[PDB]
A paper describes a structure:
To define the spatial organization of [name], we obtained a 2.05 Å-resolution crystal structure of the [name] region, encompassing PHD1, Zn-kn and PHD2 (residues 267–454). The structure shows a globular architecture of [name] with the three domains being fully integrated. Five zinc-binding clusters formed by the C4HC5HC5HC2H topological motif stabilize the overall fold. The Zn-kn acts as a platform orienting PHD1 and PHD2 in a way that the N- and C-termini of [name] are faced the same direction. The three domains are joined through a zipper-like network of hydrogen bonds and hydrophobic interactions. The structure of [name] reveals a unique fold for zinc-coordinating modules and suggests that this domain may represent a distinct functional unit. The superimposition shows that the histone-binding site of the PHD1 finger is located on the side, which is opposite to the interface of PHD1 with Zn-kn-PHD2. The histone-binding site is not occluded in the [name] [name] domain, pointing to a likely similar mechanism for recognition of histone H3 tail. One of the basic clusters contains a Zn-kn residue K383 and the K390 and R392 residues of PHD2, whereas the second cluster contains K422, R427 and R439 of PHD2. Our structural study demonstrates that many of these residues are found at the zinc-finger interfaces, suggesting that the structural stability of the [name] domain may be compromised in the cancer-relevant mutants.
Residue numbers in the entry: 274 to 427, 438 to 450
């Protein structure tokens, strides 16, 4: 079982993988922004609010995974928020609400995702390789198993198309 935000499976005992009691969402306490482990059942933000209906991500066309509410009446994947450079979290410990979506350039919405082939159905990011303009939705890149790594150089997030997967 694996955290659906960082795609890693941690046997960590303090920063554990929580399972939503209702939708079986799997996420690292620290990846989803959970202050502490509760005694009893844990519910993700989606299952706390409309447990029966699926929500849309404001930033992509995919429907599974870990969601938070935005500050403007919508929902968004934590991973989409993490990877689209203009998007923010108002609280960076609770990782919510997702905000600054209005700061995304319109250009991101005019790109075509090469994985799902859709244009205008989300905000695309692009291959980190210089002069590669191949674009993809964050969750499409994730689902397709593209290389996507987060590394702070003195946080730097780098995603690549399958041509430019790095050494
Ligand atoms: Ca709404
Ligand atoms: Zn994680
Ligand atoms: Zn849930
Ligand atoms: Zn999304
Ligand atoms: Zn896509
Ligand atoms: Zn590329």
């Amino acid at each position: 079982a694996v955290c659906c935000i960082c795609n890693d499976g941690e046997c960590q005992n303090s920063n554990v993988i929580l399972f939503c009691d209702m939708c079986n969402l799997a996420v690292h306490q620290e990846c989803y922004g959970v202050p502490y482990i509760p005694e009893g059942q844990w519910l993700c933000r989606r299952c706390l609010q409309s447990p029966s209906r699926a929500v849309d991500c404001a930033l992509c066309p995919n429907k599974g995974g870990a969601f938070k509410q935005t500050d403007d009446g919508r929902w968004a994947h934590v991973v989409c928020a993490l990877w689209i450079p203009e998007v923010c979290f108002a609280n960076t410990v609770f990782l919510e609400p997702i905000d600054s979506i209005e700061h995304i350039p319109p250009a991101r919405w005019k790109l075509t995702c090469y994985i799902c082939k859709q244009r205008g159905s989300g905000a695309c990011i692009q291959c980190h390789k210089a002069n590669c303009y191949t674009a993809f939705h964050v969750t499409c890149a994730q689902q397709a198993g593209l290389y996507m790594k987060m590394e702070p150089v003195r946080v730097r997030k780098t995603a690549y198309c399958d041509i430019h997967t790095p050494p």
